[PDB]
Amino acid sequence: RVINEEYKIWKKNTPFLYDLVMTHALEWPSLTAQWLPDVTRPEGKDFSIHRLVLGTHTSDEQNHLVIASVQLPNKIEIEIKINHEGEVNRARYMPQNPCIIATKTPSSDVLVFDYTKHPSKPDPSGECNPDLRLRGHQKEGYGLSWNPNLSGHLLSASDDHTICLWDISAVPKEGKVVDAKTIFTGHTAVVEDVSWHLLHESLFGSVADDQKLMIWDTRSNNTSKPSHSVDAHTAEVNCLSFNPYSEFILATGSADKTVALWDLRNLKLKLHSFESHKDEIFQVQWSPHNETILASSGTDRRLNVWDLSKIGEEAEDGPPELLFIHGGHTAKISDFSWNPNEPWVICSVSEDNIMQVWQMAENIYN
């Protein structure tokens, strides 16, 4: 309706809005997307090869954890599919060994796969044979975060109102199950997301349907009370992201249709509220290359890119800090990931099976 018209305007202006737009329909939709950190740049080719961690979300068919390759200028193909029990709610690679991938399932167990220990072609028997099953939750969830300073320390958020932490660094070779090291119980509702700080090995944040942002210190013996509890939004908080250049700064996204900006030195007062989304926000992620650049996505089928440096600048298109609106998707966006090796390239995935790899025009970000 308005979707068809707004899509027509988008199509029309696409040649001026983008330096790259690649569109691919996956067999089944992916709920998750994350660029792997590796890139190969062949000497006798005009492209480089990047890889993505994806998943399936099926009805009445075998699900898989997926690694796909993407050719980017200086084609998209499925390289690996691993049998997965149920849809992949979220999949994230371990920074210290990106062959290790944790997944969230529609049941309580959190799974870990080392993809070098599985065939690239899945057995049609469909057995899910994860390297580890991580126990501690009672329900499925979404939030998942590996500690970049403590190898094998993984956080998980669950619809059971808890956050679990595992340390998988010293599991016996033939051990296949790991019990949670610590369970954090501060939230009073579904915990939607969790994320470690980039620098402080003991600091992580969580957000929940209780409308709160909580900041946790793993060195504390009290796992029921966070270091800070913040009334962050006027509705469910679905996501958070720490700024990788500015150690005190983070962002949260919410069902209240806003992204909030926070300073860890004064959490009692929101620094800023980014307003433009027309429905619930499910993902927020800072740019890996640019300190003032943040993106957000959700149910309004839009991915907004925000530039903090334009806050308060001197109309009807949106606020000055709204840099770009990506309107390529015509269904709810499930996840997205900034490419870590190619500035301004994003992969976003929507519920209608579409994956887009795109890059706004150079003249837009200067």
Partner: peptide, 9 residues
């Protein structure tokens, strides 16, 4: 809930 009903291409 959060997830929709998926369909194959």
């Amino acid at each position: 809930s959060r997830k929709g009903r998926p369909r194959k291409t």
